[PDB]
Design a protein around this nucleic acid. Structure first.
Ligand SMILES: Cc1cn([C@H]2C[C@H](O)[C@@H](COP(=O)(O)OP(=O)(O)OP(=O)(O)O)O2)c(=O)[nH]c1=O
Ligand SMILES: [Mg+2]
Ligand SMILES: [Mg+2]
Ligand SMILES: [Mg+2]
Ligand SMILES: [Mg+2]
Ligand SMILES: [Mg+2]
Lengths: 1087, 268
DNA sequence: CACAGATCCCCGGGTACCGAGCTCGAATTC
DNA sequence: GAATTCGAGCTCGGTACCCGGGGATC
């Protein structure tokens, strides 16, 4: 059949029939619990409505769409299919070894067979044509390589010719511990003598290296980790894709391309439908010279997006437990699968896989037809295997280029793949885009102790989980899809909790249809989120600019972007990037960060101009020409250069460091940063000319590019990371600290009196407000300075602050550096170092790290804290009282009555006290959160509330959170039962032992800890408003609790016997006259 | 001056500091029910109700306008409005004023301090003045009426009767008074007795014919009345209630009293 | 296998005092 | 014989640090 074998199920005649027993409707009520199980012998079928078909039968008809040409060797295209391909968008790039013995019958030309002769690496470009045909171009050529110093290799293994070195590298692989390099010869390792320079230092001279062309780059991973581990290999971590992108100038990992005539006239050689490696329509065999970038096209092809969502049932003794993939009875029941078009954003198909009958409710069908959405194609199955096989068959046949969903990397794909590999033993290596031997794998953090994220790598399929896209574009306490839907989409959805799915599924098809409706609506919400944020476009802009494919952009982190950009620059300039990490693996820091000036804490009702540097550390790297290639630790490399004119000299970490200037050697990091700073500036140049809803999204996109810009700095200062230089990173921060202080001293020296301010800026003449002028920095941070401008009006203070900032940046700093007046607060509450609130001029409130902007707290405390700060800032007669509080030292307020304005500031607190005890207290207002952030075994302090509740959830078999989830929890009241239970699982209990989770605490009506929640309400108030009271949290706490209404009762078991002993009560439980008359009765009784 | 006003200049204040002399820290986490007829200082120690009346005549000036007010003594939860009247907290103190200023649901009370100087003047230690807010909801259960029969005692007498009383719930005690002077405070393995006159076991009292035998189940009396360091005083019995109660009022500088609840098992 | 940086506030939990109480135990000492 | 006291010790929690950890702010 095919030359290469297709490792996906094209046919099946026997499988493992698992299915719930309640699906067999006419069978007695006592054969209903549990599931069936066990082998069955029939091709898997799918019932779409009244019809029925084999799952794996492509044929003509079909219950789901198909974009596949081949299916298990048969060619299902109309004869005469031969689309011409001249331009093809490329979205993913694979690489995969290809053996010239394996492609004997494939009938390539010579010039590819000889490019794989024992073996080659083939760079597969996946993509679409403008007419929608799925291309796969195979780029022969393109073999990886590294460098080793010529003299170093010549010495450590006596070498006279390069061939003798190819021989020795082969010799070393043939002796490897386990026989992975069988037959390896002296011709798999061609080498030449190149004349490159290491990139770490200015003094380094261009040596002679050997450039060693490996094929089959896993041999390079061996020949890089095990070959002569005392010689230094330079670029042995650079995979073949990066060699393809970089070696060919112009090429991109995401963009339109074009086939060319080629080197002599050699052409693209269209493969024969049997020799297809991928699931594509047309396939080609090029080399890098038959390809052209085809700039001028921008638009995105017709690519498809699948947006799936599984629903699972637990089928064990406890059907309220949460499903588990390993258990054969905790089975998937439904798979919603929406099929959008990525270019037009148009939902095309709405598929619902359903184990058993599913009749979707009419109301839902009519809401779909009302909104114009396709009609749901409900596909029914008997067994879970057939349902999952049909889902994977859709994924293979349709072949969505992009997949998404919500939490599809931590629950949906792991659940499904655990089923398909543990239980049903299906090889997923062919269910990607390659017909076999492709990666279809998930990774999760799994106590790895650095891993930032759980990844997923299907080949030729870009999985964008919207959970991770939204956690880094919106600050929410809870990232459940309902909370995210409300907060982003303004869509109050109804969630079905997994505890209510067994009760529904057991009933007829109409409730199973209700489950299917909640499944579809989840996926419709996720499609809306995807097309609001459009993550593929921003991430492809980054992938295009970095040089990495889009999946490495989504998953691999910020360092490989910088490493690839730097690698492009280095290879142009004639440099090479050593490997150090190849030999490599408490709040500790690597070097000294930035300066945070001491705030003059307090409520400042005068204007506070906030200057700050634009792109500070990138501008330092560019201004001062910081790099690896410009650093000199030793004052000899610059012994023939003028000081101050040809090189900077700075004491960093007590080490004198010489950074030669441009016009001697341009930094490599400067040029890298140019490219990324231009990208960020282009995104920002559309914020003023966009919608409000679009300026918010654009703000987040320029913030992402800002992170990639600051990661160039960060990449120098990562210890045991790729290509680090803490001399450059420590120099960046050293110049940053110098500039913060230089700016403060300039402002303090020049503009100390109003005459000098007026001499610089005559437009200050119309800005003198009546008090006595002064201009003092009252706070600063890495780049900002807060200049408290007394005696100046806030009206035109930013318009002159721009001119001040240009004045300072001209007088002090080098050209790429630029200080700029970014705000003006008409009121500021400098709480602490990284904490402050303030109303920007004539405008918005800026809250910076004061726990109203922190995801810890409960909405109750946040709501009341916001109410208080709104009183302080907006409500006049409380800003007057608050500004009056500074005329006394804090302790005088402990004696004196607080100014008569601040009473409303305690009315809020008093109201909140009322509101906290009131017995409706919907406990969603009282739900704290915390991020797990590492395996619960990697903690040392295992006495945290979210860990407590994590283990309570795993104890009850509920849904255990994931490593970066947020773990919501309530603080339940300490009760003799809770006490006994905690000691059972093992006074006054800790808040880590009163740590229930809200679902439990509603189901079991566990009551909240009013003491805790109010003490923390007052704690948040105290943390903010200690700035009014001389930053004394103690005094503030005392003065805030003086608001609260104090209450005293003789307790029950005391009040009882007192009412029994003929004492009448006087106070609450009687009318005021009745209390007075009884008080008369007492006073005359005692007298 | 400000509407409700309680001033203790010297020479009547020396009596009030003397009243607080023995008590130590006891009445600091207390409740101060001020109003007409004076101030009542109530606290709970060990589960019993201890009172310390301070009459309106018993201040250099006592003046009240409005309904009675009730303050927790712990200002901001450490300090105390009575800590001024302690044994040696402020050595050189002479005077205190308690000025109240507000409207009936919301009064606040301020306490200023005055220390002696040379040449007849006073420095106001404004670092240690106190400000409290009226409770804004409260109710206390004060004792009422007058006892059945009350007997005055001394330090050695009262010390030994407190020695006679129990240790824990095992052994309930009983202040029976027999006919013609058989006052007795016993338990099973200790018993003490006095004569009741209307030498060394001849207590004085009034209405001595009113025999009974009260019974207590809770033996916190010894701890309670030892903390307050009572110097012997009145022992008052209250039995015309379903729950009899015994009150104890030192005749030393203070009138600090303590009511103890005698369980309903009343018999003669 | 995986991988930008640092600074810094505040909370929770832990542990180490120690000034202040404050209750008996043999010394004074009525 | 017997009201002091204050050493004797002893549990008392406020206060002080310290540390991890969440999660802010450059
Ligand atoms: C926000 C942020 C800042 N920084 C460092 C680098 C910055 O140069 C320095 C100052 O921070 P920012 O003011 O936040 O960033 P910036 O000034 O560089 O960029 P912009 O023009 O938008 O203001 O802090 C990081 O390293 N990472 C970050 O994620
Ligand atoms: Mg789901
Ligand atoms: Mg999901
Ligand atoms: Mg900045
Ligand atoms: Mg700026
Ligand atoms: Mg800034």
């Amino acid at each position: 059949g095919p030359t290469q074998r297709h490792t996906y199920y094209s046919e099946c005649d026997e499988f493992r029939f698992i299915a719930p027993r309640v699906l067999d409707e006419d069978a007695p009520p006592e054969k209903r619990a549990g599931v069936h199980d066990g082998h069955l012998k029939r091709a898997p079928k799918v019932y779409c409505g009244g019809d029925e078909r084999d799952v794996l039968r492509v044929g003509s008809g079909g219950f789901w769409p198909r974009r596949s040409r081949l299916w298990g060797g048969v060619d299902h295209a109309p004869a005469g299919f031969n689309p011409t391909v001249t331009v093809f968008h490329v979205y993913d790039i694979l690489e995969n070894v290809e053996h010239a013995y394996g492609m004997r019958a494939a009938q390539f030309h010579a010039r590819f067979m000889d490019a794989i002769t024992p073996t080659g690496t083939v760079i597969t470009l996946l993509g679409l044509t403008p007419e929608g045909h799925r291309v796969a171009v195979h780029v022969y050529g393109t073999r990886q390589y590294f460098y080793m110093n010529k003299e170093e290799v010549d010495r450590h293994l006596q070498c006279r010719a390069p061939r003798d070195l190819c021989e020795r590298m082969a010799a070393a692989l043939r002796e490897s511990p386990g026989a992975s390099f069988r037959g390896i010869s002296a011709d798999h390792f061609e080498a030449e003598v190149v004349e490159r320079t290491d990139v770490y230092y200015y003094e380094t001279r261009p040596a002679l290296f050997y450039r060693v062309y490996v094929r089959s780059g896993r041999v390079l991973s061996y020949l890089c980790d095990n070959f002569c581990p005392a010689i230094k290999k330079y670029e042995g971590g650079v995979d073949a894709t990066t060699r393809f992108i970089l070696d060919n100038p112009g090429f991109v990992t995401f963009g339109w391309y074009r086939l060319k005539p080629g080197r002599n006239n050699t052409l693209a050689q269209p493969r024969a439908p049997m020799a297809f490696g991928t699931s594509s329509d047309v396939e080609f065999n090029c080399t890098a010279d038959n390809l052209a970038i085809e700039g001028g096209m921008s638009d995105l092809p017709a690519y498809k997006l699948m947006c799936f969502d599984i629903e699972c049932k637990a089928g064990g003794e406890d059907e309220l437990a949460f499903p588990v993939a390993g258990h054969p009875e905790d089975l998937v029941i439904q798979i919603s699968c929406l099929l959008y078009d990525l270019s037009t954003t148009a939902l095309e198909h709405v598929l619902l896989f359903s184990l058993g009958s599913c009749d979707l409710p009419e109301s839902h069908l009519n809401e779909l037809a009302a909104r114009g959405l396709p009609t749901p194609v409900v596909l029914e199955f008997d067994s879970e295997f057939e349902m999952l096989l049909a889902f994977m068959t859709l994924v293979k046949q349709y072949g969505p280029e992009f997949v998404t969903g919500y939490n599809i990397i931590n629950f949906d794909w792991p659940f499904l793949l655990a089923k398909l590999t543990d239980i049903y033993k299906v090889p997923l290596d062919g269910y990607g885009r390659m017909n076999g031997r492709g990666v279809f794998r998930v990774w999760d953090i799994g106590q790895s102790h650095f891993q930032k994220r759980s990844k997923i790598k299907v080949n030729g399929m870009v999985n964008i989980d919207m959970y991770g896209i939204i956690t880094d574009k919106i600050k929410l306490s809870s990232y459940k899809l309902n909370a995210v839907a409300e907060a982003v989409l303004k869509d109050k959805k109804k969630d079905l909790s997994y505890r209510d799915i067994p009760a529904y599924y057991a009933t007829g098809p109409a409730q199973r249809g209700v489950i299917g409706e909640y499944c579809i609506q989840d996926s419709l919400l996720v499609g809306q989120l995807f097309f609001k944020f459009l993550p593929h476009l921003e991430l492809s802009a980054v992938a295009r600019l970095a040089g990495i494919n889009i999946t490495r952009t989504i998953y691999d982190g910020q360092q490989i972007r910088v490493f690839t950009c730097l690698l492009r620059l280095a290879d142009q300039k004639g440099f090479i990037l050593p490997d150090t990490q190849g030999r490599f693996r408490g709040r500790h820091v690597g070097y000294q960060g930035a300066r945070v000036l001491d705030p003059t804490s307090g409520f400042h009702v005068n204007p506070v101009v906030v200057f700050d540097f634009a792109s500070l550390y990138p501008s330092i790297i560019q201004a001062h020409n910081l790099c690896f290639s410009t650093l000199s630790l030793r004052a000899d490399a610059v012994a023939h250069l003028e000081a101050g004119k040809d090189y900077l000299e700075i004491e960093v970490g007590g080490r004198r460091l010489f950074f030669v200037k441009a016009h001697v050697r341009e930094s490599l990091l400067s040029i890298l940063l140019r490219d990324w700073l231009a990208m960020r500036k282009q995104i920002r140049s559309r914020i003023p000319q966009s919608s409000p809803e679009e300026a918010v999204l654009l703000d987040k996109q320029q913030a992402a590019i800002k992170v990639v810009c600051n990661s160039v700095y960060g990449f120098t200062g990562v210890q045991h990371g790729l290509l680090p230089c803490l001399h450059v990173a420590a120099t960046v921060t050293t110049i940053g600290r110098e500039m913060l202080l230089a700016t403060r001293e300039y402002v303090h020296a020049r503009w100390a009196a109003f005459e000098q301010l007026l001499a610089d800026f005559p437009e200050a003449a119309d800005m003198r407000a009546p008090g006595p002028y002064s201009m003092r920095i009252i706070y600063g941070d890495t780049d900002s300075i807060f200049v408290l401008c007394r005696g100046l009006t806030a009206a035109g203070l930013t318009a002159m602050g721009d001119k001040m900032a240009s004045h300072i940046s001209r007088a002090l700093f080098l050209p790429p550096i630029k200080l700029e007046c970014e705000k003006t607060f008409t009121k500021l509450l400098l709480i602490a170092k990284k904490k402050y609130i303030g109303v920007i001029y004539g405008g918005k409130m800026l809250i910076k790290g004061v726990d109203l902007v922190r995801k810890n707290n409960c909405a109750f405390i946040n709501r009341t804290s916001r109410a208080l700060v709104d009183l302080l800032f907006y409500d006049d007669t409380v800003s007057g009282a608050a500004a009056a509080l500074a005329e006394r030292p804090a302790e005088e307020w402990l004696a004196r009555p607080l100014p008569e304005g601040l009473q409303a500031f305690g009315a809020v607190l008093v109201d909140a006290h009322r509101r906290i005890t009131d017995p409706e207290r919907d406990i969603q207002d009282f739900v704290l959160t915390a991020e797990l952030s590492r395996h619960p075994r990697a903690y040392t302090n295992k006495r945290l509330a979210h860990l407590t509740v994590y283990y309570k959830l795993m104890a009850r078999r509920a849904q255990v959170p994931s490593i970066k989830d947020r773990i919501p929890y309530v603080i339940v009241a300490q009760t003799r039962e809770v006490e006994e239970t905690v000691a059972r699982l093992a006074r006054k209990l800790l808040v880590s032992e009163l740590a229930e989770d809200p679902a439990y605490a509603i189901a079991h009506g566990v009551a909240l800890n009013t003491d805790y929640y109010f003490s923390h309400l007052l704690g948040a108030a105290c943390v903010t408003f200690k700035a009014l009271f001389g930053n004394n949290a103690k005094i503030t706490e005392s003065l805030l609790k003086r608001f609260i209404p104090e209450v005293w009762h003789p307790p029950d078991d005391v009040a009882a016997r007192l009412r029994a002993a003929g004492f009448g009560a006087v106070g609450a439980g009687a009318t005021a006259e009745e209390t007075r008359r009884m008080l008369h009765r007492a006073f005359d009784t005692l007298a | 001056g400000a509407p409700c006003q309680v001033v203790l200049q010297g020479a009547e204040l020396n009596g009030i500091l003397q009243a607080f002399a023995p008590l130590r820290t006891s009445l600091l986490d207390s409740l101060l029910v001020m109003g007409d007829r004076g101030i009542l200082i109530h606290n709970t120690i060990f589960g019993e109700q201890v009172f310390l009346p301070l009459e309106h005549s018993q201040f250099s000036r006592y003046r009240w306008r409005g309904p009675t007010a009730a303050f927790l003594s712990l200002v901001d939860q450490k300090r105390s409005l009575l800590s001024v009247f302690r044994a040696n907290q402020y050595p050189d103190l002479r005077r205190v004023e308690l000025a109240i200023t507000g409207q009936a649901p919301f009064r606040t009370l301020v306490q200023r301090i005055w220390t002696t100087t040379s040449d007849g003047e006073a420095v106001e230690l404004a670092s240690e003045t106190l400000m409290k807010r009226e409770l804004t909801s409260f109710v206390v259960l004060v004792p009422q009426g007058t006892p059945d029969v009350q007997l005055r005692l001394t330090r050695p007498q009262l010390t030994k009767v407190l020695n006679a009383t129990g240790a824990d719930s095992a052994t309930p005690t009983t202040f029976e008074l027999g006919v013609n002077g058989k006052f007795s405070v016993f338990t099973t393995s200790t018993c003490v007795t006095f004569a009741a006159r209307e030498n060394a076991k001849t207590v004085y009292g009034e209405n001595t014919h009113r025999t009974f035998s009260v019974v207590v189940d809770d033996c916190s009396m010894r701890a309670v009345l030892r903390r307050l360091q009572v110097a012997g005083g009145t022992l008052k019995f209250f039995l015309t209630t379903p729950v009899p109660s015994l009150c104890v009022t030192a005749t030393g500088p203070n009138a600090v009293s303590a009511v103890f609840l005698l369980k309903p098992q009343k018999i003669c």
